Amino acid sequence: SGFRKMAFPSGKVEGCMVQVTCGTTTLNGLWLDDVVYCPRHVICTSEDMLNPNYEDLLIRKSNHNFLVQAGNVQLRVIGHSMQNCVLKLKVDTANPKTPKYKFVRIQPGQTFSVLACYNGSPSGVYQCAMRPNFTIKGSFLNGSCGSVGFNIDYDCVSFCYMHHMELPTGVHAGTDLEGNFYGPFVDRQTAQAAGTDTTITVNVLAWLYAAVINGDRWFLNRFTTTLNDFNLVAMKYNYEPLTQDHVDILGPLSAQTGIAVLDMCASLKELLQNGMNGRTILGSALLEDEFTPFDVVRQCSGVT
């Protein structure tokens, strides 16, 4: 019964990773039943990415321009279609590893496991959270474009993210697999800044509950709050709001621990104003916001 930054098992997703090259441009794609998803800029040239014309460039290219190799097999490409800022590459062959899947636009704060790939090969797996400012801080190098973010729910893999760029501040931005960018970003090779980032409040509650499960009660305070009240202090400390629905989201964990959410709110509210007092929680000197409520359950239940 510890608590670690835990990722979903990757094997299903590893079986759908492709290398996609156009000319001298190489990226990663995700190959599910006969179609291959990869960022549209795979077509773009160095000099072209400063000011690309994507529609124009796609008219110029033909199906033969796109060379997709899964392992030691080349894939024959029958079609070149732009889906917003994502390319859909039709192949003759269809991935026999294609699992039960959906394409989900997660919310800011939702966590997901990122499978990092270079040359369509996995280099490993880590967990990241959708920052409220619509950025993700993971571990992305060149060759990473097209790597994917995902949750696993029973048999289904819920794909949430495709990687495109690292910002000048060193954070990372991407799209959903419908090609819709998260946050206020475009796939130009220009410096772009996010916004001012904020702490995910419901995630922190989840984390304090996780401590109470690992025998930490010291932060618990037997006074009470209101949502309205608590939220007004949370805005002073640049915290994301809490909503009733969040309380229901946390209810299950509230059941196991026997601490009503507002009791745990009242504890946090005090940790924000007075700081952390030089104590440690789950072996952090800092408050943690990149664990979701279900993440707390799943990891401390061993969900699969």
Partner: peptide, 13 residues
């Protein structure tokens, strides 16, 4: 940068 790739060089960070 834009986290693309080449075929043999680096074009980075």
């Amino acid at each position: 940068x834009l986290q693309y790739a080449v075929l043999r060089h680096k074009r980075e960070x």
